[PDB]
């Protein structure tokens, strides 16, 4: 799955 | 666990999200908004896939495009890069 879940983990990564 | 094995997509993801956070660094409201949108879409998609089959989501790909479009004015560039992630629906 690559469309939304990807951007989700990315943001959660940079954030914390 | 994912399924892909290309570290390129990950890099592109961080670049985009970072681009938005930087472009809207002044207004943290816009950033938090977009995030909440994606989060909601996730809970909806999962609910449907967990409901077995009989279920009607309230937030789909088209619905997200519309909402993000209204919130993102004069910024079709970002909306485009976001739509690219969406498969052939």
From Swiss-Prot, chain A:
Report the PTM annotation: Ubiquitinated by BIRC2/c-IAP1, leading to its subsequent degradation by the proteasome.
Q: Where in the cell is it found?
A: Nucleus
Q: Which positions carry the signal peptide feature in this UniProt record?
A: none
What does the subunit section of this Swiss-Prot or TrEMBL entry state?
Answer: Heterodimer with MAX; the interaction is required for DNA-binding. DNA binding requires dimerization with another bHLH protein; does not form homodimers, and does not bind to DNA in the absence of MAX in vitro. Interacts with RNF17.
The record's function comment reads: Component of a transcriptional repressor complex together with MAX. In complex with MAX binds to the core DNA sequence 5'-CAC[GA]TG-3'. Antagonizes MYC transcriptional activity by competing with MYC for MAX binding. Binds to the TERT promoter and represses telomerase expression, possibly by interfering with MYC binding.
Protein name stated in the entry: Max dimerization protein 1
Q: Which organism is it from?
A: Homo sapiens
Full-protein interval shown: 6 to 21 of 221
Swiss-Prot record, chain B:
Gene behind this chain?
Sin3a
Within the intact protein, the region shown is: 295 to 383 of 1274
Mutant phenotype after disruption:
SIN3A knockdown causes a significant decrease in the amount of cortical progenitors in the proliferative zone at the peak of neurogenesis, and results in altered neuronal identity and aberrant corticocortical projections.
The function of this protein is: Acts as a transcriptional repressor. Corepressor for REST. Interacts with MXI1 to repress MYC responsive genes and antagonize MYC oncogenic activities. Also interacts with MXD1-MAX heterodimers to repress transcription by tethering SIN3A to DNA. Acts cooperatively with OGT to repress transcription in parallel with histone deacetylation. Involved in the control of the circadian rhythms. Required for the transcriptional repression of circadian target genes, such as PER1, mediated by the large PER complex through histone deacetylation.
On tissue specificity, the annotation reads: Widely expressed. Highest levels in testis, lung and thymus. Expressed at relatively high levels throughout brain development. In adult mice, expression is high in neurogenic regions such as the subventricular zone, rostral migratory stream, olfactory bulb and dentate gyrus.
Domain called PAH: residue spans? 6-89
Where in or outside the cell it occurs: the entry states:
Nucleus; Nucleus, Nucleolus
Question: Assembly and interactions?
Answer: Interacts with ARID4B, BRMS1L, HCFC1, HDAC1, HDAC2, MXI1, SAP30L, SAP130, SFPQ and TOPORS. Interacts with OGT (via TPRs 1-6); the interaction mediates transcriptional repression in parallel with histone deacetylase. Interacts with BAZ2A, MXD1, MXD3, MXD4, MBD2, DACH1, NCOR1, NR4A2, REST, RLIM, SAP30, SETDB1, SMYD2, and SUDS3. Interacts with PHF12 in a complex composed of HDAC1, PHF12 and SAP30. Interacts with TET1; the interaction recruits SIN3A to gene promoters. The large PER complex involved in the histone deacetylation is composed of at least HDAC1, PER2, SFPQ and SIN3A.
**This chain belongs to which protein, by name?**
Paired amphipathic helix protein Sin3a
Q: Post-translation: what modifications?
A: SUMO1 sumoylated by TOPORS. Probably desumoylated by SENP2.
Impact when changing residue 32 to A: No effect on binding to MAD
């Amino acid at each position: 799955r690559m469309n939304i879940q990807m951007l989700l983990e990315a943001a959660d990564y940079l954030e914390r | 666990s994912l399924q892909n094995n290309q570290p390129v997509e990950f890099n592109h993801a961080i670049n985009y999200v970072n681009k938005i956070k930087n472009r809207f660094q002044g207004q943290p409201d816009i950033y938090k908004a977009f995030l909440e949108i994606l989060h909601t879409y996730q809970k909806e998609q999962r609910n449907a896939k967990e409901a077995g089959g009989n279920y009607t989501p309230a937030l789909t790909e088209q619905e997200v495009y519309a909402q993000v479009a209204r919130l993102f004015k004069n910024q079709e560039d970002l909306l485009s890069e976001f739509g690219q992630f969406l498969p052939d629906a």
